[PDB]
Structure formats: C-alpha cells, structure tokens
Amino acid sequence: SAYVQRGAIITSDGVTLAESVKQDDGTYVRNYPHDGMASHTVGYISTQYGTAGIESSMNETLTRSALYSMAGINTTGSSVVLTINSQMQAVAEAALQGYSGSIVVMDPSTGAVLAKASSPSYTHAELGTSQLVDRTTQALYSPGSSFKTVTLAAGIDTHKTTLDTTYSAPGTMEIGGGTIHNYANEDMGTIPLREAFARSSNTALAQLGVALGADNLVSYARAFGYGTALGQDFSTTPSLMPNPAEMTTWELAWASCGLPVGEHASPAGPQTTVMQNAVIAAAIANGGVVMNPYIVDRVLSPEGAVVSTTSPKSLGQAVSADTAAQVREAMLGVVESGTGMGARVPGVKIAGKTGTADVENGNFNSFFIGFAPYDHPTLVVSVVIEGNGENVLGYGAQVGGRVLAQCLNIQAL
C-alpha cells in the first residue's frame, strides 16, 4: 500500500501542489512543490496532526494483491485538479501578510472557489517537526455588520421595507429592554434605509430585525446556507443561528446587526464562516440563487484522461431576483459613499458590506464581503482580518478591494 503511487493535486492553471515520488526502496514519498501555497486546502495526512484538506477529503481518489512486488504495476492514483487559480491564490496570500484571518474568492454563478487562504499558514516541511486552523471554513466568527446583508435581504423580500423607507437612526435606543447603539453613539437623524445600510447604523438595522421577527431572520439565514455544511467536496463547519423560539427581542435586535448575544439552550447567533459570507455575497451577486461551493474541477486518470467533472449545484433561491438587485444596489452605496470606501478601485464599480466585531480584550475583527464588477459580477470576495490588540478598522474593505482588482486583472489575462 506504500508501493502504490498517490495521484497529484494540481491548480486549474496547471501548477502542481502535491506529487508522489517513487523511491529506489520501492515506496513513494509525498512531495509538495511551492510548499506553503494553499497549505490548508492542499492538506495532509499526519498521525500527529490529523487529516485535512484535499489530501483527506479526496483520499479515495488519490489512492495479485497478495504480491507486494506487483502493487506498483496495476494501480496508480488518479489526480485532482482544483478550481483554485495560482495567481489569485498568490494575491490572497500576499494580502494576508502580517495578519491573521482569511480570504475567499469565488465565482458567483457556480460557487467555484478560485482562491482560499488562511493566515497564519504553515508549510508541509514544518509539519515534520493557530497555523493549523483553516480560518476560511473551520473557524466561527461573529459576522458583525456584514450580516446586515441578510437582514436587509429578508426585509426587502418579505416586502416589509424598501431602500427608500426612512428610519430613525439615533446614537442610542432602547429595544426589548436593552440598549442598542450606533458606533460612537452617532445620532444620524432620520435617514433612508439605503443610507442606514451604507453607514452601517445598528439602531436602524436593529429596527428592521425586530420588524422581521425571529422566524424570518433565522429562516432567511438558513436559506442562504446557515445550518449547512457548505462545500460539495470540502468540509466547512456550519454557520449557526439560534432556535427562533428561544430568542428575545433584544437578542434579535443585535443578531440582526450580526452580534450573537443570546443565552438559551440553542447556540447564540449569528456565528459565521468566511466561506458562508462569500456564499451570501455570491447569492446576492447571482440573482438570489445560492450555489454550493466546490473546490475540485475534475479528476484525471494516471494517463491524463478526465475521469469526472464536478457539476455546479444550487442550494435553492434565498431571495427573489428583484430582491437581490435591491441588495446589490445597497451594497454599491456602501463602497461609493459609506463605510466601504476603502474598497474602491479606480475604473471598476465594486460593491459590498463591511463589518467590525469586537471580540474580547480590545481585540476586533474586520470583515468585508463584496463583488465585482457591479453590473455583471464575475467575482466575489469574503475577508476577515483579525486585529488581536491592533485596531484594524476598515482593513477588511481595503484588503477586499485590493484582492478584487488584482483578481479582475488576472481574469482579464
């Protein structure tokens, strides 16, 4: 079983990330060129460290029986070609230098994952002696205000509000017996929803969440993927919402701003992955149709023939096409005139939603989900930049825009 060659793992643009090399001993050593590129996605099988990535999820595939001397002769492993593009991957990894967190770039029409990066990373060379967490798919975060994309989508789709409906947006407001507050306790007066969303007012969006109710908020979150182990061919931990029946009015108000404050048997929520955030942006960019993301394009036989091809698959329609257009327009506002201006790229219309989530000890995380170009989107990005001690306000947006622009150009060629 070690005299049988393992198939390769290869990017869509033909860059080999994992090979098996025959010894004169007879056995095969696993080799990792460009060691350190997409480590978490490529993965490993380690007694000490466990199993991860494609090496495990596609183990079966990458794989006279009484004669060990003949094991090499018949079997050889079929290879795996990923949807990952090595140049978009490099872009994402460079944008994370110096930060913990993660980036996903995806095609919104199919769910294909074009880049997937987590930091800190590791090399396979180091395994042979935090970094091991895959922060794209296997870490949960409070999404903070990036989850307002779901609140807004739900509000519009149930026909409880429109972008031009006005809301009071005071610095502080009592809801369900607790206080909600805007950033800096900024009183914004009465403003249209599109502006409350662009400026990320908690007090406005909280009122929308309360107007929706717990059943609707959870229901729409689930229709975007919450509760589902996203990925046709990779493992993602599901994003979580509470049991609506257990939620309070104050809890609902904060949940609808992306802050899990609940105390009950079921999980507090929302708690999201970065991958789930990309799936939401994708669904909005793709007329409301949610795609199940996937990272394997196809399988090749040892001789080079296509054994199989992944088909894109939908997880359903989370909001109508009309609703998605309204959400996309609101997202454009975020970047043109609101909290997302740091994601602007001269020459291209970029849309999205930011967030900032305070996690303990003065740590905060900066989020961005977005897509480009605005009119016929072909890319989506999801980012988290972890602050831990450092203030990283707006960093998700700056990283998001930067990644989208460079990836658009690679797309161009």
Side-chain angles (χ1 to χ4, degrees), residues 274-287:
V274 172
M275 183 64 73
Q276 174 62 80
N277 252 0
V279 166
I280 285 162
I284 292 303
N286 191 49

Side-chain angles (χ1 to χ4, degrees), residues 25-294:
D25 200 25
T27 45
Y28 278 92
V29 72
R30 198 46 155 183
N31 191 50
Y32 295 97
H34 311 93
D35 195 5
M37 175 161 272
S39 297
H40 294 87
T41 298
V42 169
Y44 48 82
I45 286 153
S46 164
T47 295
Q48 184 186 171
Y49 296 115
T51 65
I54 292 300
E55 288 286 29
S56 97
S57 69
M58 296 285 121
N59 213 329
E60 291 247 80
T61 305
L62 292 163
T63 287
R64 285 342 204 246
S65 41
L67 278 51
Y68 283 38
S69 60
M70 295 191 327
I73 282 48
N74 188 99
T75 318
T76 292
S78 52
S79 288
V80 172
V81 182
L82 307 179
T83 54
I84 300 292
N85 173 292
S86 71
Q87 290 189 70
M88 299 189 192
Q89 187 66 29
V91 164
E93 294 175 351
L96 289 176
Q97 278 305 331
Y99 298 93
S100 292
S102 80
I103 302 177
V104 176
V105 179
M106 170 185 289
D107 181 296
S109 76
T110 58
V113 180
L114 305 180
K116 176 170 169 301
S118 186
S119 169
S121 204
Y122 68 77
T123 65
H124 295 85
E126 290 158 33
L127 294 183
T129 82
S130 183
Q131 307 108 288
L132 293 178
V133 175
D134 188 341
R135 295 171 159 79
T136 68
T137 50
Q138 294 187 329
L140 292 172
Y141 296 101
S142 307
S145 298
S146 66
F147 185 84
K148 298 173 180 179
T149 304
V150 172
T151 307
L152 182 61
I156 296 183
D157 208 55
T158 58
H159 301 307
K160 277 165 177 267
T161 200
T162 65
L163 292 187
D164 298 301
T165 307
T166 61
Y167 285 79
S168 173
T172 212
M173 193 181 160
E174 271 208 24
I175 305 189
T179 307
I180 311 293
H181 56 83
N182 288 336
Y183 181 70
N185 265 67
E186 195 188 355
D187 179 1
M188 317 188 169
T190 292
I191 56 179
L193 184 58
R194 63 179 69 247
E195 180 179 349
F197 186 83
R199 298 169 65 187
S200 212
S201 170
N202 298 320
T203 50
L205 269 299
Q207 295 171 65
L208 180 54
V210 175
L212 282 160
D215 279 15
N216 277 316
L217 188 66
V218 171
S219 185
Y220 274 90
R222 289 177 64 75
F224 285 104
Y226 272 67
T228 293
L230 301 167
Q232 287 199 51
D233 47 19
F234 59 90
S235 160
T236 301
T237 200
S239 300
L240 309 175
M241 295 296 290
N243 184 325
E246 294 183 2
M247 285 178 87
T248 59
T249 288
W250 178 72
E251 180 190 348
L252 172 60
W254 277 125
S256 70
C257 296
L259 292 191
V261 303
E263 287 216 357
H264 35 59
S266 63
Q271 299 188 48
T272 190
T273 59
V274 172
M275 183 64 73
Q276 174 62 80
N277 252 0
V279 166
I280 285 162
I284 292 303
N286 191 49
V289 175
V290 184
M291 300 302 283
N292 199 5
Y294 67 95

Side-chain angles (χ1 to χ4, degrees), residues 236-390:
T236 301
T237 200
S239 300
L240 309 175
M241 295 296 290
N243 184 325
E246 294 183 2
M247 285 178 87
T248 59
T249 288
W250 178 72
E251 180 190 348
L252 172 60
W254 277 125
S256 70
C257 296
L259 292 191
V261 303
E263 287 216 357
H264 35 59
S266 63
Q271 299 188 48
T272 190
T273 59
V274 172
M275 183 64 73
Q276 174 62 80
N277 252 0
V279 166
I280 285 162
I284 292 303
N286 191 49
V289 175
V290 184
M291 300 302 283
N292 199 5
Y294 67 95
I295 202 151
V296 175
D297 190 64
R298 65 192 186 272
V299 175
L300 300 188
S301 75
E303 19 290 330
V306 178
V307 175
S308 68
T309 296
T310 305
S311 53
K313 289 187 186 52
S314 173
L315 292 172
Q317 178 136 21
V319 297
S320 73
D322 292 351
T323 290
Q326 292 301 290
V327 181
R328 288 195 293 280
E329 180 180 318
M331 283 176 111
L332 175 67
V334 170
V335 175
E336 312 237 270
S337 82
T339 60
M341 285 182 264
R344 288 195 260 153
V345 175
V348 67
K349 295 167 92 71
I350 284 160
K353 185 59 185 87
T354 53
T356 310
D358 222 282
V359 303
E360 279 44 42
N361 296 338
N363 295 330
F364 39 103
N365 294 346
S366 178
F367 294 84
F368 179 79
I369 54 175
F371 63 84
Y374 179 72
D375 290 306
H376 290 101
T378 61
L379 293 171
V380 150
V381 70
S382 177
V383 186
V384 66
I385 301 300
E386 297 184 31
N388 43 46
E390 198 190 328

